[PDB]
């Protein structure tokens, strides 16, 4: 995946707080109604 903040590839929920899908909470579908509305 790609970082929420570094803008780098090679990223995951353990490389940073979240991938670009989120920033912290990173649940499987929450972003479309909270973090990406
Ligand atoms: Zn990062
Ligand atoms: Zn979130």
From Swiss-Prot:
Coiled coil: none annotated. A zinc finger (CCHC-type) spans 1-18, 20-37. It comes from the Viruses. This is Nucleocapsid protein p11. The lineage of its organism: Viruses, Riboviria, Pararnavirae, Artverviricota, Revtraviricetes. The gene is gag. The chain holds residues 381 to 417 of 486 of the full protein.
């Amino acid at each position: 995946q790609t970082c929420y903040n570094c803008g780098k590839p090679g990223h995951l929920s353990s490389q940073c707080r979240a991938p670009k899908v989120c920033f912290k909470c990173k649940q499987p579908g929450h972003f479309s109604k909270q973090c990406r509305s």
